[PDB]
Amino acid sequence: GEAPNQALLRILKETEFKKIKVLGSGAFGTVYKGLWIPEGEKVKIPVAIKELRATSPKANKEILDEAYVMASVDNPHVCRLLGICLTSTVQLITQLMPFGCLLDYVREHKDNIGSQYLLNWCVQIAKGMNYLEDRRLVHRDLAARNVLVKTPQHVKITDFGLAKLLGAEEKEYHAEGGKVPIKWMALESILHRIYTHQSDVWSYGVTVWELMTFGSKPYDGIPASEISSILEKGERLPQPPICTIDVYMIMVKCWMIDADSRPKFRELIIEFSKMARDPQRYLVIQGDERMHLMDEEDMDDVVDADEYLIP
Ligand SMILES: CN(C)C/C=C/C(=O)Nc1cccc(-c2c(-c3ccccc3)oc3ncnc(N[C@H](CO)c4ccccc4)c23)c1
């Protein structure tokens, strides 16, 4: 009737891993960096570990839903669950992504990110998303904050809270508890709480826009109430400065009204691959190589004394 989900859910002992330091104490719990040392083996695996504070009644069924889907994915551009630990409070264990979320990263390194990294990230995210679509899965929260950085050359999608499965028969998902980030959401999602792989494509467009802007807040001024209307009026996010029309047009197609006329992730991979073979033709970034005499002002007639000889 549907494909059986034969994913393993590993149970891990509290003793076989050491928390080292807190990475993030949000209102969603806290996440530690840690080391997982399975006793059987002779390995040590850098991990991230997530738990929530009291047992919130629903929220403990929420984190186990996240566990369910993180354990059900296996792609190089998607964070997989390593195991759960059933202590007083449940802990999710996953591979450590040392450089944190992409959003922070484009901000903390604006001046040192070239077109090849930007376009290669766009490829990689579309592969991750094309995989989740192959696995009949709808993320419902794609955003630059929810893409983590293993290295600057390798990013993966994460945060599978909110993610939902869809059999062969359904093409859609009707949410109820509407607390989803408004500014990454398709129109159909904001109006009718409909979620499709093509609504993920919209959120992909907004994610790409975040990156090409080195981490700007979309609709930076505007409040969530309005978003529905101005998107309906036909307004969209502006063309980022570094973006050619070629790139910006792909974004805009992710933001069409008719969801079926937006591009498929399998297409976004192709089109961004093509572009990543000649990056500087499609993204113009002042200084696009390396910016390395440490003066900190604006001067184009600076010469070095070693090249200024006896007048
Ligand atoms: C809000 N803005 C700041 C945008 C960016 C937000 C952000 O990066 N938050 C975040 C919060 C907590 C941990 C992490 C986080 C970091 C990290 C590493 C170094 C510095 C900072 C973070 O490394 C991670 N590796 C794997 N999963 C992670 N974290 C998810 C939680 O979803 C997870 C862990 C275990 C199991 C499942 C999932 C993280 C990332």
DSSP 164: E
Residue 186 is part of a domain; what is its CATH number? 1.10.510.10
Does 285 sit in the ligand 1 pocket, CB within 6 Å? no
201 and 123 within one domain: yes
Q: Write down the residue that tokens 């440490």 correspond to.
A: 294
Question: Residues 242, 268, 233, CA angle at the centre, nearest 5°?
Answer: 70
Binding-site residue numbers for ATP are 23-31, 50, 94-95, 159
The experimental method behind these coordinates is X-ray
For residue 97, the ligand 1 atom closest to its alpha carbon is: 25
Query: Do 130 and 173 lie in a common domain?
Result: yes
Tokens of 135: 């696995």
Q: Which residue in 143, 160, 141, 276 sits closest to 211, CA to CA?
A: 143
Both ends of the chain: CA-CA distance in Å?
87
CATH code (residue 84): 3.30.200.20
Q: Are 41 and 31 in contact (CB under 8 A)?
A: no
Full DSSP string of 270-293: HHHHHHHTSGGGTB--TT-S----
34 with 179, same domain: the answer is no
Catalytic site residue from 65, 74, 111, 141: 141
Of 220, 157, 232, 147, which is closest to residue 189 (Cα–Cα)?
232
Residue indicated by tokens 């998607």? 78
> Does residue 146 form part of some domain?
yes
Q: Is the dihedral of CA 67, 155, 139, 127 positive or negative?
A: negative
Residue 193 domain boundaries: 97-298
Asked whether residue 206 falls in the same domain as residue 270, the answer is yes
Residue from 31, 36, 70, 162 to probe ligand 1 pocket by mutation (most atoms less than 8 Å from CB): 31
Same domain, yes or no, for 125 and 92?
no
Distances (CA, A) of 119 to 98, 111, 122, 271: 21, 16, 5, 10
Spatial CB neighbours of 180, under 8 Å, sequence gap ≥ 6? 140, 141, 162, 189
Residue 154 backbone dihedrals phi, psi, to 5 degrees: -140, 110
- Between CA 103 and CA 304 the distance in angstroms is 38
* Residues 140 and 41 reside in one and the same domain: no
Record the tokens describing residue 34, joined without a space: 């840690």
- Give the DSSP letter string of 198-238: HHHHHHHHHHHHHHHTTSPPTTSS--HHHHHHHHHHT--PP
Tokens in use for 97? Answer: 């992504």
Residues 195 and 282 in one domain: yes
Q: What is the resolution of this structure in A?
A: 2.9
Residue where a domain terminates, one of 96, 113, 132 = 96
Decide: 137 and 164 in contact? Cβ < 8 Å.
yes
Domain shared by 113 and 238, yes or no: yes
Which residues on adjacent β-strands are paired with residue 165? 137
**Domain identity same for 92 and 103:** no
Cβ(104) to ligand 1 under 6 A? yes
Whole-angstrom distance, CA of residue 274 vs CA of residue 185: 27
Is the Cβ–Cβ distance between 161 and 175 less than 8 Å? no
Q: Domain end: 96, 130, 149, which one?
A: 96
List binding-site positions. 23-31, 50, 94-95, 159
Is the separation of the CB atoms in 125 and 299 below 8 Å?
A: no
Q: Does the annotation mark 65 as catalytic?
A: no
Angle, in degrees to the nearest 10, between helices 115-134 and 265-276: 160
Name the E strands within 10-117: 17-26, 29-36, 45-51, 81-86, 90-95
Amino acid at site 203: S
Overall domain count for the chain: 2
If DSSP codes are grouped into helix, strand and coil, which group holds residue 78? strand
